[PDB]
């Protein structure tokens, strides 16, 4: 057994963190007081769930996770929430005042004073690991902490844990729920800095989750609670292989091996189905697999038809057998536009977990008998980079808000250096994806 440490940074990372760990407990039969009746090896063991949970002599299963925020408000709700007994205070790190949606403030000013404390708390979790795989880092693009401190943390993690893998769950900014106008700045700045330190990053566009919650859950005005419970389902689908018995993606390095042929292009598109309202009073393997190629079900709105695939993974949960999947794939292949790059094989890696997806009791999501999350590395996700870089260019041409960043000790040149790196990234997708 090999352990995975989760790191939740800033408001988005923390609130999504709670959604995920709440879901994990429901999936593994772990009570809010840390007890797990089905675990017979008391106070120890090396089961698949032990990748995420350590054990105390009193039979308490605690998350291998650290929560860090430069403001105490959000994590204080974890300290007094329903799952307060789950974590110990050392795991929950809070600062005094936040980064005010300023990358420079989160990275340089405030990051410098708290980075050693964070690393030390992480070191304590790592010292309890017989074989650490690496880290799963949850954060937003648009927040000052989520962007600025994460990038600093990822740099320091590469130094302290060179051999370990690092996976990202990143929240891409959307105006419908955004709380800052400079989020494109923060997004580009943190992507530039974290790029060489991240092995695989799963971007989640709040716009996509927002519209799915409206369209499929009939929620007029989705809240963070709505968004995060949907996000945690996708995250759970991706990490289920690390927490349950299986043979596909049972290790962090396997994500890179299966989804990331070229290091810089490490942003797989996630697509999930089905999303059914709980108030509404069952789709087949063929139907939910077909939905994986509908832009309306993707975590990032883009058009894979006008791009190329480098790799594709299908993660099923529930009543699914290989025969159904192959028949479904055969039908879809002759029905849709699925172009792979020439230097890669046209195929799918499939993983099935017989346990159907677990939903939060009294939530918006209905219990389904089978679901699927498709992870595909497609060049079409570069559309999200293009949108973001354009908004960057609009403001930066006038140097709008730049003084806030320079005021925190950041140099103006970092803006252009970060933007140039993104321009190179867009070019990389162009070369891989387009013919001429």
């Amino acid at each position: 057994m090999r352990e995975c440490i989760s790191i939740h940074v800033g408001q988005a990372g923390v609130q999504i963190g709670n959604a995920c760990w709440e879901l994990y407990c429901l999936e593994h039969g772990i009570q809010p007081d840390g007890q797990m009746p089905s675990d017979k090896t008391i106070g120890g063991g090396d089961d698949s769930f032990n990748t995420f949970f350590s054990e105390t002599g009193a039979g308490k299963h605690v998350p291998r996770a650290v929560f860090v925020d430069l403001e105490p408000t959000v994590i204080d709700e974890v300290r007094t929430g329903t799952y307060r007994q789950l974590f110990h205070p050392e795991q929950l790190i809070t600062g005094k005042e936040d980064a005010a949606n300023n990358y420079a403030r989160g990275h340089y000013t405030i990051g410098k004073e708290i980075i050693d404390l964070v690393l030390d708390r992480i070191r304590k979790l790592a010292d309890q690991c017989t074989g650490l795989q690496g880290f799963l880092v949850f954060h937003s693009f648009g927040g000052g902490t989520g962007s600025g401190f994460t990038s600093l943390l990822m740099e320091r993690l590469s130094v302290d844990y060179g051999k370990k893998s690092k996976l990202e769950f990143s929240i891409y900014p959307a105006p419908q729920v955004s709380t800052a106008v400079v989020e494109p700045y923060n997004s580009i700045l943190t992507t530039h800095t974290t790029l060489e330190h991240s092995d695989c990053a799963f971007m989640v566009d709040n716009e996509a989750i927002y519209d799915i919650c409206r369209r499929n859950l009939d929620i007029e005005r989705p809240t963070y609670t709505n968004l995060n419970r949907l996000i945690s389902q996708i995250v759970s689908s991706i990490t289920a292989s690390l927490r349950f018995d299986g043979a596909l993606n049972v290790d962090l390095t396997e994500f890179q091996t299966n989804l990331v042929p070229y290091p810089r292009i490490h942003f797989p598109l996630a697509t999930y189905a089905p999303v059914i309202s709980a108030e509404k009073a069952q789709l087949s393997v063929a139907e939910i697999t077909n939905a994986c190629f509908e832009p309306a079900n993707q975590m990032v709105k883009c058009d894979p038809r006008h791009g190329k695939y480098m790799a594709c993974c299908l993660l099923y949960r529930g009543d699914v057998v290989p025969k159904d999947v192959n028949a479904a794939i055969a039908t879809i292949k002759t029905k849709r536009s699925i172009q792979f790059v020439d230097w890669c094989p046209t195929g799918f890696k499939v993983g099935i977990n017989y346990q159907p997806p677990t939903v939060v009791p009294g939530g918006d999501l209905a219990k389904v008998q089978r679901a699927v999350c498709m992870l595909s590395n497609t060049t079409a996700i570069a559309e999200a980079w293009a949108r973001l870089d354009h908004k960057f260019d609009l403001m930066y041409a006038k140097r709008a808000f730049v003084h806030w960043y320079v005021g925190e000790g950041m140099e103006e040149g970092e803006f252009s250096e970060a933007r140039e790196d993104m321009a190179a990234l867009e070019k990389d997708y162009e070369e891989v994806g387009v013919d001429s």
Partner: protein
């Protein structure tokens, strides 16, 4: 109050469309880079499709189908027809794609069919230049630089009388956001004013029926353009048949086949933005009244006489259909 932006000032069609929108009083034009639009009259090249459909509270529509270039590029059209199971047809002339020596490629395949012609003593005239020698053609391609397409030159075309004139048929096709295919009932024939010559292919003036090349001009019909009512009457007088039976049935068939083929690739049925597009199909008719597709134009102009009616039709079924304001000129090719 609906809003739109203009990013192609060189479009004669949509300059008229944007004019009509303003006349309704319910449409307002914005600056080029204003993102808060309902409608985008986009640019011919590098249209930022990736930035469309991400403005909350806005239904956004664009006048181009992303991926339609597959049909509208000569090199792409040949590839499409050959490699698509639905298309690989009898209505498309024998074609091959050729890359220059200094610039995969089917050159040995083109020469393979060239042999049957010469060693069969039949028609071996091809067009890129219109020469009967493959050497004179290939030496021309390598000298230019760009990628050219080699296609069989239809040596036996239908000829208009009097004058022994060669012509081509232009059809305008509008495809809306629901992927309804609308054929404008008014087409046009681009005619050659010089008599068709069988011997000398050096004189490309009579062979090429482009309006610019033609401009004997305006002797027979005004602007070297014959319309459908006149051409139908000609077919009734000369060949005892109608335009609908002998030609239009084939035309409607070809348009359906081409557009239905690429539909799953370009449809915006479940996209975060919607597309429509005006197409210009160019046809060739042989002496046996058989219709051949020559090419598809993605950004076609219209006949001066037909601008008012066509552009209004674009507003009614493509724009107002998505944005309703406070018999038909099109033929709906159903599917």
């Amino acid at each position: 109050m609906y809003t739109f932006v203009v990013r192609d000032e060189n479009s004669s069609v949509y300059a008229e469309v944007s004019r009509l929108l303003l006349a309704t009083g319910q449409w307002k034009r914005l600056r080029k880079d204003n993102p808060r639009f309902n409608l985008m009259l986009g640019e011919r090249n590098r249209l930022p499709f990736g930035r469309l459909g991400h403005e909350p509270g806005l239904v956004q529509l664009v006048n181009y189908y992303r991926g339609a270039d597959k049909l509208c590029r000569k090199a792409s059209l040949v590839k499409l027809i050959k490699t698509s199971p639905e298309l690989s047809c009898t209505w498309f002339p024998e074609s091959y794609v050729i890359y220059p020596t200094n610039l995969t490629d089917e050159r040995e395949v083109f020469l393979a069919a060239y042999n049957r012609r010469r060693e069969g003593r039949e028609g071996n005239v091809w067009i890129a230049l219109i020469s009967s020698e493959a050497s004179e053609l290939l030496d021309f391609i390598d000298e230019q630089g760009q990628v050219h397409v080699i296609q069989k030159y239809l040596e036996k075309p239908l000829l208009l009388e009097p004058g022994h004139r060669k012509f081509d048929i232009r059809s305008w096709v509008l495809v809306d956001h629901l992927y309804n295919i609308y054929l404008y009932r008014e087409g046009v024939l681009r005619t050659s004013s010089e008599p068709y010559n069988s011997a000398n292919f050096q004189d490309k003036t009579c062979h090429l029926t482009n309006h610019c090349i033609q401009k004997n001009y305006g002797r027979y019909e005004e602007g070297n353009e014959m319309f459908f009512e006149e051409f139908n009457q000609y077919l009734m007088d000369a060949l005892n048949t109608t335009l609908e039976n002998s030609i239009l049935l084939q035309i409607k068939h070809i348009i359906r086949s081409c557009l239905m083929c690429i539909e799953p690739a370009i449809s915006t049925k479940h996209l975060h933005y919607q597309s429509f597009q005006l197409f210009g199909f160019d046809f060739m008719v042989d002496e046996e009244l058989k219709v051949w597709l020559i090419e598809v134009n993605g950004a076609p102009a219209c006949a001066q006489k037909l601008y008012a009616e066509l552009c209004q039709g674009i507003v009614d079924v493509a724009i107002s259909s998505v944005f309703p304001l406070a018999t038909s000129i099109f033929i709906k090719l159903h599917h």
